[PDB]
Design an enzyme around this catalytic site. Structure first.
Site, short mmCIF file in Angstrom:
data_model
loop_
_atom_site.label_atom_id
_atom_site.label_comp_id
_atom_site.label_asym_id
_atom_site.label_seq_id
_atom_site.Cartn_x
_atom_site.Cartn_y
_atom_site.Cartn_z
N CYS A 45 0.83 -1.20 0.00
CA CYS A 45 0.00 0.00 0.00
C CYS A 45 0.87 1.25 0.00
CB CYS A 45 -0.92 0.01 1.22
SG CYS A 45 -1.87 1.53 1.39
N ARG A 88 3.60 2.08 5.95
CA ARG A 88 3.91 2.29 7.36
C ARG A 88 5.33 1.78 7.64
NH1 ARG A 88 1.26 6.09 8.58
NH2 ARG A 88 1.58 5.62 10.81
N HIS A 117 -1.94 -4.03 5.45
CA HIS A 117 -1.54 -3.65 6.80
C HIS A 117 -2.75 -3.14 7.55
CE1 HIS A 117 -1.97 0.57 5.74
NE2 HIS A 117 -1.28 0.32 4.64
N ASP A 171 0.57 3.75 1.57
CA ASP A 171 0.75 4.24 2.92
C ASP A 171 2.19 3.95 3.32
OD1 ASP A 171 -1.73 5.36 3.56
OD2 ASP A 171 -2.60 3.38 3.90
ZN ZN Z 1 -2.77 1.29 3.35
#
Ligand code: ZN
Ligand code: ZN
Ligand code: ZN
Ligand code: ZN
Lengths: 219, 215, 220, 219
Positions: D42, D46, D98, D44
């Site tokens: 993703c 993390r 996630h 994102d």
């Molecule tokens: Zn994500």
């Protein structure tokens, strides 16, 4: 609505007129199950491909997007091409532009219309790629010129797809075409790019651009 | 391949007949500068939309892809829609399917046709979504029903796009229609999903599926 | 396959060697919930961006594709960009290329690699766009040059999207950057295009192209 | 914004304590000319995949999009997949989601966020497909259940591409993996869909969904 109702009405009149006329239209259509031509035109659809070519119903496999483009990474159009070539075994793919195209006008326009602008950014890259030829031309005439150049550039993109190249490579017979018609006379005019191989693609492509670059003293 | 030649011979014969015979076809065509209907049909293009609707030339903005799809993330189709709604201010988008659709048949056949299979996977998902209904049929009849359901699903995807939703949000008038015609008689048939807002989209879509699931 | 069993091992090891320390990495991350930079890099991912900027974890929003492109009509990347700009409100978008790029090499190579060639045709269009310039260069250099030009052309593409134009136009704070680090050095080299508005985009792109067109000794 | 300077700074220093340190790194990294893993995560991001796998620098070929999706018709991700398979000969493709994912939350919220919503409609479709399950689940739990389900559905989509089917068909070695890690502890967890052929994809996929359909007391 009013227009939708009217539409169903026309459909009913027509469909049944055929019913009565004992018309063999649908039966004829049924005889031409598999198309022989892939026609890629504009969504403007000013003069129907059927009318321009007077082909028998069912002969054309059609795809239409704004400004009749074959973008390198457009899954939609590439899907249509790979299916027409690898599955339906079509041998003629025809890209057809038309004068007074809203797609062309919107691309040349400086107004930011939203999502559609991104799609038209490819026409703009084509505009600048030929900025000199075009700028060296009178405004009122540029539209028709970008429209003609657009077609040559799209035929060139089609011919470079991995799909089309593999078809030729494996000896399959396949020829690309690129025409334009004036919305006033309805005549199909060949733009010059016509390929049956990668070789003919390059030559006819250079040749067409070179030809279009030779301007008359009328601008 | 005298085809191309014969093709140009046809066009010339036609456009020539128009000129000398003084046909105001281009004259009238020129009158209708802005279309009023967006037609999303199948590339098979068996019976031209111009005929099915017997409309005045220039009235239709047309998009055609394999199996008349409106994929959530297709830049091609979504662009045609955004331009037509936001720019041309069209008020009626019509998705039209057709019986004996090669696209639908290829989606069902279990054979790797290549790139196009990826495009048809969306059809196969719709097939699974309605597997209980479609599983009761024979391959043959399953194709006719998937064709009708496909149109209903596409209308449903079109009404869920951010483009169509924002049009309704700012009060623009816009209706979605999903039809199918048999390639044997040409009669257009409403499938049940007709929207003018998001709420009407949900309602008619559900009602339509409910109706289609009755054998 | 041990590769997957092994790989899973490393993860357990890493993860546990964190849980026992009662470390705060899984805390010093849940605080930086919202990123402030959108990183657009190549799938090659030679030198990671989390390491080239040594930024705190969770500060980057990332998207990687073959040869870091921003194609006018690519729904994937435009979606990342739009979500970044309009929803995350991030203010910096970086398009970082890298030297010795398979993507770039594949685009220049004559071989037909299949589907990916179509995606690379955009790089080849760029290649001919600067045919004269690149021609003058020395072979061993052409590759690395295109890499640089590509990045320039990508920032210009990004700046021309309706998503970025509407951002600027509505008074939202947003800048576009285009660099190229080297696999050996690891030093981020700005390329010249640093739009902050459409006017900027035009000038910087215009100049950046002029600067790269000035060939040095090495390049014939 | 000085953020670019403050950031550009960290780079000149870090990259410096490697030159004036003869630190191999760029030496070793260069040794891994070709990756052996395709990681689809993703945007994102993390916990980086480089720290999750702790693999060797350069081993990963990466693609990231909002909510790690493999959409049937996405030219971007399909190109990365095809290249990694037909060209890099990678034999492992991992899809990694996630917990507490922005894409998932946005997909579940009614708020029309613009273009991105179209991209996330694919997730909402996955949501409806497992509407009964997710419904039975608890509100503050749905997001995480859909996140796991999503990974399962994406591996399935990836296994169904023509690119992958063809790789298998011609006897190429290739396995698909679908894991999810908790941003609170970085523990990679197999979701159940692991495939090395079209047949294992089917069984593995069906089993995985069956298992997730089993809901523990804490909804
Ligand atoms: Zn994500
Ligand atoms: Zn047009
Ligand atoms: Zn059809
Ligand atoms: Zn690269």
């Amino acid at each position: 609505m009013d227009k939708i109702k009217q539409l169903f009405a026309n459909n009913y009149s027509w469909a049944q007129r055929m019913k009565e006329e004992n018309s063999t239209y649908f039966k004829e259509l049924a005889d031409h199950q598999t198309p022989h031509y892939l026609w890629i035109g504009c969504s403007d659809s000013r003069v129907p491909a059927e009318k321009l070519t007077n082909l028998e119903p069912g002969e054309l496999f059609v795809h239409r997007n704004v400004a009749n483009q074959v973008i390198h990474t457009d899954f939609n159009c590439l899907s249509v091409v790979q299916y027409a070539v690898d599955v339906l075994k079509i041998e003629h793919i025809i890209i057809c532009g038309h004068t007074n195209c809203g797609g062309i006008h919107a691309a040349m326009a400086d107004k930011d219309l939203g999502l559609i602008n991104n799609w038209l950014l490819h026409i703009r890259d084509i505009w600048f790629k030929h900025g000199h030829l075009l700028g060296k031309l009178s405004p009122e005439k540029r539209a028709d010129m970008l429209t003609k150049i657009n077609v040559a550039e799209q035929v060139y993109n089609l011919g470079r797809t991995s799909i089309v190249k593999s078809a030729w490579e494996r000896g399959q017979k396949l020829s690309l075409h690129g025409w334009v018609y004036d919305v006033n006379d309805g005549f199909l005019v060949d733009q010059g790019v016509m390929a049956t191989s990668r070789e003919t693609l390059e030559i006819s492509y250079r040749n067409a651009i070179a030809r279009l670059s030779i301007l008359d003293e009328e601008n």
